Structure formats: C-alpha cells, structure tokens
Design a protein around this nucleic acid. Structure first.
Length: 46
DNA sequence: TAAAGAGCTCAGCACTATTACTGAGAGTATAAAGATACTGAAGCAGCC
C-alpha cells in the first residue's frame, strides 16, 4: 500500500504543529487505504 | 362469675437505599491480506 516511513513523518509533523486547527489528509487518505485493505483480510470479508 | 377495659405484638401494604450489573469508553503500536427478449428513448456520434 503505502510507505510506513512517510507516515511516521507526517504524524511527527502534526505532533509538532499540535504543539502550537486541522491535520494533513495524506495520513488520512492512508488511513482509509489501510482500513479498506485490512477489510480484505481473510477472517473478515466473508 | 364474666362482660368489659387498655395494651403486646404479629399479618399485611410501602420505601429507600442497595447491589449486581449491564452498558459506554477508552486505551489498543506483526502483518500490507457471469446462458430472456423486446420495445423504446435520449445521448452520442459522424455529415453536407
């Protein structure tokens, strides 16, 4: 799906900003992505 | 002797405080996981 590392980056960055409102959606798109990919796991998707 | 006091405490309907107790919530950091048939109607598509 998606490089875990870049996600660490984005979230570190929203950490730093929340240390000041919203967050980037890059990480949010990736979240949708990973949710939907897990959905196709084998116990579920049944 | 026996009708008649005044009270000693036991059925019989609540009440408040209770006690499991079921629900709402908040933590979660390995993975990449298909054998109708027909008619019709606008839209699309090429043309002088």
């Amino acid at each position: 799906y998606v490089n875990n590392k870049e996600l660490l980056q984005a979230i570190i960055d929203w950490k730093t900003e929340l240390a000041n409102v919203r967050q980037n959606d890059t990480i949010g798109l990736a979240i949708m992505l990973i949710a939907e990919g897990l959905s196709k796991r084998f116990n579920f998707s049944g």
